[PDB]
Write a protein that binds this ligand. Structure first.
Ligand SMILES: Nc1ncnc2c1ncn2[C@@H]1O[C@H](COP(=O)(O)OP(=O)(O)O)[C@@H](O)[C@H]1O
Ligand code: ALF
Ligand SMILES: [Mg+2]
Ligand SMILES: [Zn+2]
Length: 661
RNA sequence: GGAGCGUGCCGGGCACGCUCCGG
């Protein structure tokens, strides 16, 4: 299959060496077009080196095996893999290759590197191909790489690589006016240093349907959770507490209350707020999947549990546990979201032939939908072979899927060994399954880019796209708005394409200049906030029992990421709990040791890091209240702390530790 | 499981997600 006319046309500017964005519909074959650009680019001058940037782990392998491998007749093409069992540094890999395919953060790491073997410059490439280039916005890695490109361009750096952006959907960036949308397109062009947006000016699409579901007539499971939540809030004895149970707003307010209580050391308020968040999580789960999924959320929280507040809460759950379980087994109170999804799958998987992705928000939700499908008698004998697909995201609630684990599911899905995926947003862009003919979006609240992309996974002739949402909801509204935003985005792109060259050029220079200036201001602002306090005047307190445990001056950063306490006497404040934590990925310089906890109350603090031949405690900031002479604050991220932290030195630490004994 | 980022949401937060951690 040689290139279609539209492909050749879309890459004509790139073939003349112009920076461009190729804007072609989902599944139009932007990738093969880009490969052709790389072939002629590399042919047209020796010494050329191409970087192909992607934004999902599995796209590295997909792009190699289905497209970029054809360049191996004449050129060396390397796909970066986190699973290589002969690992070297990026610079070595890239400098010894004609084409390097990697996730963008791999390149950004190399572009910022200290060590000489790993270091790379933008000038070491003659072409950057940026897949799904609509992510080249704000502080995403695509935009960090390109902001550096702009800085260099504006200072008169020469032989910067050519830029080839690929996307189906620049988006409108929240803008709902023509003027706004046009400005957003220009901002994307500015970010990517685009000379021309090239399209097919001179690919089937699915029939779309709204599968609306009504609120549950009777929800005694949810009602009972709400009654319990009211009881806990009465026990807290506080006026003006929120009543809007089962909402993300209540979730926010109750965690904010939890944080204020942590900051003032209000133990009873904080612990009750903690548990209330869990009950609220259960309501959200109840509204999204099965009652029993919501029950298991609460049950696992209380199974792993003295203090009279915490025993009041244990007692309160125990008093309702059996009733909650029995209600959860009752077919009468089934989730209409799930009934609707059953109808859809019953209709489209009769007779095997259908090849579907059901998109859901959370990793947990994907797993719960699979279990639901496997427990649903109405869907048996339909030859539905389903699996979960998630990305590499990870949390206590739900672990991720590694590169290989993702690839295993995708490869079986490709020819129908599996015929249905329950997927997170990991598979909304880029994934190419020619036989996929059904996409269902299950109660999602996304922008128009995610809508267009997810729809686009249905590659087949006569594909179907279903919006499964609650009737009269914000989800339905946002889907309808998003549809109009696609049309508006298209209008905006056409206006930028027809813009007088001189007016376009002046506008790009202006946006680029403002971008590089705004970055400098943001950087200076971040530095000032970081220098507000002497580290010696910052104390860390255990969030549970409020005991003082270390100071800011005890903290160092290992590998510009991991915040460790280097004080030899800090070991008297934490206790190591048995059980080595195991990650799937093994690192070069370290592995995780055991979890650490507060030695005076057993509150979780973080974990051991076995860094070369020493063991260092990593402190997770969320388990502490940070106290300065001005305020007490609960932090989510280390990056918002207002004292400076020095980089860890291994040599200096080893030297100082071998003094006492 | 630490970090980076994004999306949704609320008047700087909340939630979720993806990515990085020798490729
Ligand atoms: N000229 C062509 N002839 C036949 N098939 C093609 C051609 N160009 C691309 N394809 C195929 O079309 C499918 C979609 O291409 P892909 O690059 O994933 O689309 P996107 O533009 O969304 O990245 C792939 O299976 C690809 O191999
Ligand atoms: F790049 Al696409 F669907 F637009 F994989
Ligand atoms: Mg693609
Ligand atoms: Zn403690």
């Amino acid at each position: 299959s040689e290139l279609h006319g539209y492909q050749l046309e879309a890459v004509a500017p790139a073939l003349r060496g112009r920076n461009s964005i190729v804007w072609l519909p989902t599944g139009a074959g932007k990738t093969r077009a880009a490969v052709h650009v790389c072939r002629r680019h590399l042919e047209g001058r020796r010494g050329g080196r191409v970087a192909v940037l992607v934004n999902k782990v599995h796209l590295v392998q997909q792009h190699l095996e289905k497209e970029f491998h054809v360049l191996r007749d004449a050129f060396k093409v390397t796909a970066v893999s986190g699973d290589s069992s002969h690992k070297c540094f990026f610079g070595q890999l890239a400098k010894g290759s004609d084409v390097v395919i990697c996730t963008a953060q791999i390149l950004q790491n190399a572009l910022l590197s200290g060590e000489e073997e790993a270091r790379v410059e933008l000038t070491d490439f003659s072409l950057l191909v940026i897949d799904e280039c609509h992510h080249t916005q704000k502080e995403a890695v695509y935009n960090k790489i390109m902001l550096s490109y702009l800085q260099k361009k504006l200072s008169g750096q020469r032989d910067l690589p050519q830029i080839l952006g690929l996307t189906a959907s620049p988006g409108t960036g929240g803008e709902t006016s023509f003027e706004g949308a046009v400005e957003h397109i220009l901002q994307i062009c500015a970010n990517l240093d685009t000379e021309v947006i090239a399209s097919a000016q001179e690919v089937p699409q699915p029939t779309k349907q709204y599968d609306l579901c009504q609120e549950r007539e009777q929800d005694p499971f949810g009602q009972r959770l709400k009654k319990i939540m009211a009881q806990i809030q009465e026990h807290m004895e506080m006026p003006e507490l929120p009543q809007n149970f089962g909402t993300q707003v209540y979730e926010q307010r109750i965690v904010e209350l939890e944080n204020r209580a942590a900051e003032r050391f209000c133990r009873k308020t904080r612990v009750c707020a903690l548990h209330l968040r869990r009950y609220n999580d259960a309501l959200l789960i109840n509204d999204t999947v099965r009652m029993m999924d919501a029950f298991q959320c609460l049950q696992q929280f209380y199974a792993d549990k003295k203090d009279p507040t915490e025993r009041f809460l244990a007692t309160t759950f125990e008093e309702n546990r059996a009733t909650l379980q029995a209600l959860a087994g009752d077919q009468r109170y089934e989730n209409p979201r799930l009934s609707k999804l059953e109808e859809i799958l019953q209709e489209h998987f009769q007779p095997g032939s259908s090849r579907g992705i059901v998109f859901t928000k959370t990793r947990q939700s994907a797993h719960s939908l699979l279990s639901w499908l496997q427990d649903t008698a109405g869907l048996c004998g339909q030859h539905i072979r389903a699996a979960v697909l998630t990305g590499s995201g990870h949390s206590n609630q739900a672990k991720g899927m590694t590169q290989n684990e993702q690839q295993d599911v995708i490869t079986l899905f490709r020819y129908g060994e599996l015929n249905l995926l329950f997927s997170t947003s990991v598979a909304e862009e880029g994934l190419d399954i020619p036989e996929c003919n059904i996409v269902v979006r299950y109660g999602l609240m996304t922008n128009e880019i995610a809508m267009v992309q997810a729809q686009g996974r249905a590659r087949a002739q006569n594909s179907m796209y279903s919006v499964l949402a609650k009737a009269n909801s914000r989800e339905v509204y946002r889907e309808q708005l998003n549809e109009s935003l696609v049309g508006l985005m298209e209008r905006a792109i056409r206006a930028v394409q027809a813009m007088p060259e001189r007016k376009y050029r002046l506008k790009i220079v202006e946006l680029q200049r403002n971008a590089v200036l705004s970055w400098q201001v943001k950087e200076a602002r971040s530095s000032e906030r970081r220098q507000l306090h002497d580290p010696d005047d910052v104390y860390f307190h255990c969030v549970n029992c409020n005991v003082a445990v270390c100071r800011g001056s005890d903290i160092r950063t290992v590998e510009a990421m991991h915040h460790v306490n280097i004080n030899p006497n800090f070991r008297f404040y934490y206790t190591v709990s048995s059980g080595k934590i195991h990650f799937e990925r093994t690192f070069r310089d370290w592995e995780p040791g055991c979890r650490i906890v507060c030695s005076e109350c057993r509150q979780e603090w973080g974990m051991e890091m076995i860094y070369r031949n020493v063991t260092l405690p990593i402190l997770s900031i969320k388990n502490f209240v940070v106290v300065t002479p001005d305020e007490k604050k609960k932090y989510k991220k280390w990056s918002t702390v207002t004292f400076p932290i020095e980089e860890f030195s291994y040599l200096e630490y080893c030297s100082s530790t071998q003094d006492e004994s």
